[PDB]
Amino acid sequence: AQNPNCNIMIFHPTKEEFNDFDKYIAYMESQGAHRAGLAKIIPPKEWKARETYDNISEILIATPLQQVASGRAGVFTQYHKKKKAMTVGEYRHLANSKKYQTPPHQNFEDLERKYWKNRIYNSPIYGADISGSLFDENTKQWNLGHLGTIQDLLEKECGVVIEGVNTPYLYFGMWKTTFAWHTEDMDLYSINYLHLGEPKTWYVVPPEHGQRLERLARELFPGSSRGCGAFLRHKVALISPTVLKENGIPFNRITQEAGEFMVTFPYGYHAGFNHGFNCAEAINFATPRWIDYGKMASQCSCGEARVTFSMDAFVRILQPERYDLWKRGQD
Ligand SMILES: [Zn+2]
DSSP states (O other): OOOTTOOOEEEOOOTTGGGOHHHHHHHHHHTTGGGGSEEEEOOOTTOOSSSOSTTOTTOEESSOEEEEEEEETTEEEEEEEEOOOEEHHHHHHHHTSTTTSOOOOSSHHHHHHHHHHHGGGOOOEEEEEEEOOOSOTTOOSSOTTSSOOHHHHHHHHHOOOOOOOOOOEEEEEOTTOEEEEEOOGGGOEEEEEEEEESOEEEEEEOGGGHHHHHHHHHHHSHHHHHHOTTGGGGOOEEEOHHHHHHTTOOOEEEEEOTTOEEEEOTTOEEEEEESSSEEEEEEEEOOGGGHHHHHHOOOOOSSSOOOOHHHHHHHHHHOHHHHHHHHHHHO
């Protein structure tokens, strides 16, 4: 069995190897990459997403979200308070202001320390789930707007034509911008490209140990667990690496820098934070190996994980018994 310790693996494809997305994902798995639940892919030196990032200031963040925490430093939830619209230009200026700018620090480990010590006492603001792409139309390899669709994958494997179409999303982040512990909708894969700016630190639990994380979360968020059998679908809960370690939860961490891809794997619980102003793009995708994960994915029916019409068909076909209950949760 490849990668038995479930380490996060890092890949350096050549130009040739970067020419077939599906084929390279299969190759990573053949090396045991998926056991970690996350991998890093460094593109070939000659590759670029786009020419420059000089004309992105006019993109609109219709609904910036201020992330307000409740709890204690290492075990907290956050909620999203809606702010007034701002351009990326305005957002960037805000990220860089005294109130929100990255503090001076020694290195990534020093910033991580400061994040977990201090995050709860501040409320950073971010631009989430903005439909769009910063990949140049002419970029042919690993263009996140040019991947095969989950709908076509599902139809190829199962022979059922379904409505829906998934497209990439943009994220604009600042120091302390926080991604709560979660797996992807329907436990899909995800791919995340960091277009520009400061790093993102990721935490990941191996898919084979996902239930250990769920068990701990039930204990640490007892009221949340009571209200919903799949409350991590709400994407509001944070647990520090110190608390994970204290409770024996297997996990790994890695820092993504601008110009790097990260792929998350079916049922890989992940969380993280932004080091400072950045912009990332992400999309879900599927392979034949995802199908069985999609069939077993936990669903929120309490109304607190509203997703989209796009997920309707996946629940409808892969989980007929859960569909009705899920649906009315969506109503
Ligand atoms: Zn719920």
